Paper text:
Based on our 1,2,4-triazole-based lead compound 1 (OM-1700), further structure–activity relationship analyses of East-, South- and West-single-point alterations and hybrids identified compound 24 (OM-153). Finally, the introduction of an East quinoxaline moiety instead of the naphthyridine group (compound 24) again led to picomolar cellular activity (IC50 = 0.63 nM), and we prepared further variations based on a quinoxaline core to interrogate this part of the pharmacophore. Next, we solved a co-crystal structure of TNKS2-24 demonstrating that 24 binds to the NAD+ cleft of the catalytic domain in a similar manner to the previously reported analogue 1(39). The observed electron density is clear for the compound except for an apparently mobile ethoxy group extending toward the nicotinamide site. The previously identified hydrogen bonds of the scaffold were once more observed between 24 and the Tyr1060 and Asp1045 backbones, as well as with a water molecule. The quinoxaline moiety is forming π–π stacking interactions with both His1048 and Phe1035 providing improved binding affinity compared with that of 1. From these compounds, we concluded that a gain in potency in our in vitro TNKS2 assay and cell-based WNT/β-catenin signaling assay cannot be attained with compounds possessing the East 2-pyridyl group while changing South/West groups, and we therefore focused on compounds with annulated aromatic heterocycles such as naphthyridines and quinoxalines46. Such variations enabled picomolar potencies as these moieties are able to form a significantly more efficient π–π-stacking interaction with His1048 and an additional hydrophobic interaction with Phe1035 as evidenced by the obtained co-crystal structures.
Tankyrase 1 and tankyrase 2 (TNKS1/2) are members of the poly(ADP-ribose) polymerase (PARP) family of enzymes that regulate the turnover of specific target proteins through covalently linking the cellular redox metabolite NAD+ to target proteins in a process called poly-ADP-ribosylation (PARylation). In this function, TNKS1/2 also impact the WNT/β-catenin and Hippo signaling pathways that are involved in numerous human disease conditions including cancer. Hence, controlling the catalytic activity of tankyrase by pharmacological intervention provides an attractive tool for reducing WNT/β-catenin and Hippo signaling. Multiple potent TNKS1/2 inhibiting small molecules, including bicyclic lactams, compounds based on heteroalicyclic amide scaffolds, tricyclic fused ring systems and 1,2,4-triazole scaffolds, have been identified. These compounds block the catalytic domain of TNKS1/2, either by binding with high selectivity to the adenosine binding pocket (which differs from other members of the PARP family) or by binding to the more conserved nicotinamide pocket.
Author numbering:
A (entry chain BBB): 950 to 1109
B (entry chain B): 1115 to 1129, 1136 to 1161
Write the structure that this text describes.
Amino acid sequence: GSGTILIDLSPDDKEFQSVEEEMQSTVREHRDGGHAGGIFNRYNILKIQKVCNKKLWERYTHRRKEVSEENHNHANERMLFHGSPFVNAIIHKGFDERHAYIGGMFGAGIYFAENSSKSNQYVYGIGGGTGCPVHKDRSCYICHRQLLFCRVTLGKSFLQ
Amino acid sequence: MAHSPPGHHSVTGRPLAEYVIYRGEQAYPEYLITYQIMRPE
Ligand SMILES: CCOc1ccc(-c2nnc([C@H]3C[C@H](NC(=O)c4cccc5nccnc45)C3)n2-c2ccccc2F)nc1
Ligand SMILES: [Zn+2]
């Protein structure tokens, strides 16, 4: 089975508060006026869990080094938010580009954002899909959402 | 396709057999063959 352990972080833990602050402080007003991700200036942060998986970590650090050696010994590593309907799969199986939606404006890739409110727009699908499963509401205040705050190797990044 | 279908690592077609990989590290260029096509008699 999955070699993923979830480590529950305490609200009083500095690591919790750091990820919490990044989530809250990177909210912005969006051009679609909350159409995709809902209307809000703030989150209710219910849980922050460290995803521990040796297989997925060693896979990441291996590729990070390969990219590093290709880009003047610089990984160009960034902490970035990810939203998609497949967070439960990703924490167990890792990120899989074979499931990437080709219709995206930047092609068949996996999307990250430095704004939490941007990644929130993709939690229920492209353009917020049909919103939450229960109320079919993109701006649902009841249903619990999941984002990933990810270590991402950008290496030599191409501007579009 | 940009990548292998989900659960797959390659594509095989018959439009003769052709094999396609979407990652360069899934092949090693083991032998370099220098040659000419021979004019048939
Ligand atoms: C306007 C811009 O449009 C966009 C915006 C965002 C996206 C986008 N970025 N990443 C994804 C998901 C994550 C990946 N899948 C897995 O990593 C996966 C792993 C393991 C098991 C799985 N099982 C099923 C599916 N995926 C996995 C795709 N997306 C994304 C893709 C489809 C639908 C919604 C999304 F947010 N793409 C385009
Ligand atoms: Zn709901």
